[PDB]
Design a protein around this ligand. Sequence first.
Ligand SMILES: O=C(NCCCN1CCCC1)c1cncc(-c2ccccc2N2CCN(CCc3c[nH]c4ccccc34)CC2)c1
Ligand SMILES: C[S@@+](CC[C@H](N)C(=O)[O-])C[C@H]1O[C@@H](n2cnc3c(N)ncnc32)[C@H](O)[C@@H]1O
Ligand code: NA
Ligand code: NA
Ligand SMILES: [Zn+2]
Ligand SMILES: [Zn+2]
Ligand SMILES: [Zn+2]
Length: 429
Amino acid sequence: GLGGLERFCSPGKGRGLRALQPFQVGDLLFSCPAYAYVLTVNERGNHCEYCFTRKEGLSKCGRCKQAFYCNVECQKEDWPMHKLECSPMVVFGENWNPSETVRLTARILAKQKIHPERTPSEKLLAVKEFESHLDKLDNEKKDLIQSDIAALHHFYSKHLEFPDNDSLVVLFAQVNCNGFTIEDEELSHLGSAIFPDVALMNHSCCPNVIVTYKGTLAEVRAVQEIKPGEEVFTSYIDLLYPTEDRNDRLRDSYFFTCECQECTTKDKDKAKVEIRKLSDPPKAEAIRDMVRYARNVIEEFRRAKHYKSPSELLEICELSQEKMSSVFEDSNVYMLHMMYQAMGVCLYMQDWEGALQYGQKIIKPYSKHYPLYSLNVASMWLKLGRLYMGLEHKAAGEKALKKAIAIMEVAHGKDHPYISEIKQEIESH
Ligand SMILES: O=C(NCCCN1CCCC1)c1cncc(-c2ccccc2N2CCN(CCc3c[nH]c4ccccc34)CC2)c1
Ligand SMILES: C[S@@+](CC[C@H](N)C(=O)[O-])C[C@H]1O[C@@H](n2cnc3c(N)ncnc32)[C@H](O)[C@@H]1O
Ligand code: NA
Ligand code: NA
Ligand SMILES: [Zn+2]
Ligand SMILES: [Zn+2]
Ligand SMILES: [Zn+2]
């Protein structure tokens, strides 16, 4: 068990984490070494496969030529996990396409054969003790696990001895309910992992902690004062959206409805869906209908980026904003989503000016919509600072980077490798 905290039975929330000592804003509650983890395929070559160090000139794996390390020591240390994919990647060639979840579950099973004893990642909660919601799964979900089990057998049959299909369906349900995505300082996808003690914490739309990553290590820091006896709540979802949206995400992904202060009260809901103060105000049915269009275009875009062109996507972004603007104010979260999506396309296209334009429009409303310390906000300021600096706007860049640093010092810590690199960006300009 972790010092200063304890595992407990949270009424109507199963098992949780409770404080035994007071924690102040920016205080490290605990750190959890990754139990199992995997670097995302598009990040290969950018980051070391073993320690997740983003560094220039990484050593390639002579065999597969698709795994990169700091040195030979990272390579030897990652071999027990890398051997699950080394030869399969070359023997399957381009037929090699397991999903990140399948990839992660192959490594959970591998860690289980190698180290069946409780790991330093499980001082409070064990992988085997994970909640699965097996009895709550629909047909869509059960079919996804069945295609994942199929792919697990198809690609990882060489080194693993598999349990029955009932044990594999339970495991996949646990990974999908307790799995973590690792993001960088710009909230960009790096990989997926298993942090058992971090998964003991329950959800709140007003969390008292923020999870950050330092390589493959998860760090938990207070973003609100925590007093002895208080439960330690972290957010599972994006805190920008109104109550209904948040709870629709929670029920689909984690099979529960949140009763937190934000969800009970619904106080921040009206601010979130800001309506245009028109001389002829919009009707309640007109509002209900625009929120339906907004929730719909959001889904259409999630698909359209897999099959439409960069400029076809910016057109959706502009066209939907233009439609919504009649009823909705610029600060409305639905407008803000389409703006965020468009800034993402400009950043992809390497159109730094266009990205900076949408950035400038997003930032202020986005600031007030999220909690005081937010990874989303810190990343928006960071993007904005990096663009300003890029386009040689040194005064504005310095201001946005100093804002990103202020939040990041609380959530990541003053001593973080990300903050030292941002500080280095301000001193190089
Ligand atoms: O880190 C993430 N979010 C914030 C913290 C979450 N904290 C809550 C408790 C512990 C972790 C994160 C975001 N997106 C995806 C993942 C993820 C990473 C690795 C493996 C699987 C992952 N997801 C999780 C969500 N699931 C959808 C719902 C789902 C549950 N049971 C199912 C069974 C079959 C199909 C679908 C489902 C799809 C797979 C993680
Ligand atoms: C990663 S686990 C957290 C630890 C979990 N309570 C346990 O005992 O295994 C996530 C699950 O905890 C439950 N949970 C988390 N936050 C909750 C909340 N605010 N209200 C109700 N259930 C919650 C849900 O069943 C959810 O799928
Ligand atoms: Na967002
Ligand atoms: Na950038
Ligand atoms: Zn390394
Ligand atoms: Zn290799
Ligand atoms: Zn809530």
